Amino acid sequence: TELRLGLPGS
Amino acid sequence: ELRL
Amino acid sequence: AMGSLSRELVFLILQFLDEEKFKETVHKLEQESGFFFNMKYFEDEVHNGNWDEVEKYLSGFTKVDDNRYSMKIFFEIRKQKYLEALDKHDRPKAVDILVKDLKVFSTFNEELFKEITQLLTLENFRENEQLSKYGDTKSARAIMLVELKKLIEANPLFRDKLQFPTLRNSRLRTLINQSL
Amino acid sequence: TTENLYFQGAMGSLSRELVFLILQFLDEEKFKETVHKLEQESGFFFNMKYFEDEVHNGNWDEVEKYLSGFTKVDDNRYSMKIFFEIRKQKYLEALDKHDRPKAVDILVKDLKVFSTFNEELFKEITQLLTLENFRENEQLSKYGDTKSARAIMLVELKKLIEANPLFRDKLQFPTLRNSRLRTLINQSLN
């Protein structure tokens, strides 16, 4: 599982 | 009335 | 029959509180009992950026470390709150959000926390390629809300908490009138 | 069945009686925030123990929202004095913490409404901002600390509430059988 800086929903 |  | 008698009573009381228009009471009961998650209420609080209430309401149902969905829900909300503070050019507030709300996520991914921290020094956070398409507060909250609904609907902790039962109007009042 | 929902039951509306049955259920379930939000929104019962604990802790926003379910600031002379004393205390606490920007914000947003009623008083209150210590003012020379002042103010707030026609009759919880709502619904469903 990863958390990302990008906007939710890619 | 109110007071200090 | 809604499982336990306590659970059935909570649902009957929620209907009564809604008919009497005790609106804040409805959402405190949903939160404290944890029996029903009101998506419509949650969507409205998020739309309005009422972050303290959003987290207090969610806390009746889950904690940040319960599972991967709960972790991403609090992460996305706290990231939005931080980007809004940077967007209003309020760096003291953004540092306060970073330290108080986002720091917990450094225990999962320390490099991501460093990248989020580095946005503080940009003239515009949109200079970061991952955030270049961020529009404004309105567009960003709507996009975040689409993701939050998916995370809540897939979260096993919200199983049986997303459907209000079909009840005849004033069910509690009718049952009490029948009791005596 | 000769039984009423509770001992003082037949005296109010059914909605009022259901509110009291629900309040006991919420209390036994320990849904504390729901209890006090229901008291406030229904306006049927003023919980003196809860108000005391919220004042003791200086939770001023919650103290005012709670009071707002029972009275408006300008309702009568007791309500006026209740709100004035609370806002005066918040203001004095800001000055004691040497937070003059917060004190002027309390003065403008919370205490200014009282200037219409008493112009000289609001001017005297305002003038406290410029003192090195507000205890220099003769009428506040006996002010001890945050703990002592909140306790003294609470004694006065209790007397004002007890004398206020809007509260004086909402201070005693009615007499209910144990788990009354739970017992009646359980028999009605069976």
Swiss-Prot record, chain D:
Location(s) in or outside the cell: Nucleus
What does UniProt note about where in the body, tissue by tissue, this protein is expressed?
Expressed in embryo and in extraembryonic tissues. Expressed in inflorescences, flowers, floral meristems, developing anthers and ovules. Detected in the vascular tissues, shoot apical meristem, cotyledons and young leaves. Expressed ubiquitously in the pistils, stamens and pollens.
- List each copy of the CTLH domain by range: 44-102
The effect of N186H is:
In tpl-1; temperature sensitive gain of function; transforms the shoot pole into a second root pole. No effect on the interaction with IAA12 od HAD19, but loss of interaction with AP2
**What domain of life is recorded for the organism?**
Eukaryota
The disruption phenotype is:
No visible phenotype, due to the redundancy with the other TPR proteins.
| LisH domain segment(s) | 14-46
Please give the function described in this protein's UniProt entry.
Transcriptional corepressor. May repress the expression of root-promoting genes in the top half of the embryo to allow proper differentiation of the shoot pole during the transition stage of embryogenesis. Regulates the expression of PLT1 and PLT2. Negative regulator of jasmonate responses. Negative regulator of auxin responses. Negative regulator of multiple floral organ identity genes. Required for ovule development.
Quoted from the entry, the domain comment is: The N-terminal TOPLESS domain (TPD) (1-209) binds directly to a 12-amino acid LxLxL EAR motif peptide.
Describe its partners and assembly state: Tetramer. Homodimer. Interacts (via the LisH domain) with WUS (via the C-terminal domain). Interacts with NINJA/AFPH2. Interacts with IAA1; IAA2; IAA3; IAA4; IAA6; IAA8; IAA9; IAA11; IAA13; IAA14; IAA17; IAA18; IAA26; IAA27 and IAA28. Interacts (via the LisH domain) with IAA12/BDL (via domain I). Can form a complex with IAA12 and ARF5. Interacts with AP2 (via EAR motif) and HDA19. Interacts with TIFY5A/JAZ8 (via EAR motif). Interacts with SPEAR3/TIE1. Interacts with SPL (via EAR motif). Interacts with ZAT2 and ZAT3 (via the EAR motif). Interacts with JAZ13 (via EAR motif).
What remark does the entry add? The tpl-1 gain-of-function allele is suppressed by mutations in the histone acetyltransferase HAG1 gene. The tpl-1 gain-of-function allele suppresses developmental defects in IAA12/BDL mutants.
What is this protein's name?
Protein TOPLESS
Query: Where is the organism placed in the taxonomic lineage, from the top?
Result: Eukaryota, Viridiplantae, Streptophyta, Embryophyta, Tracheophyta
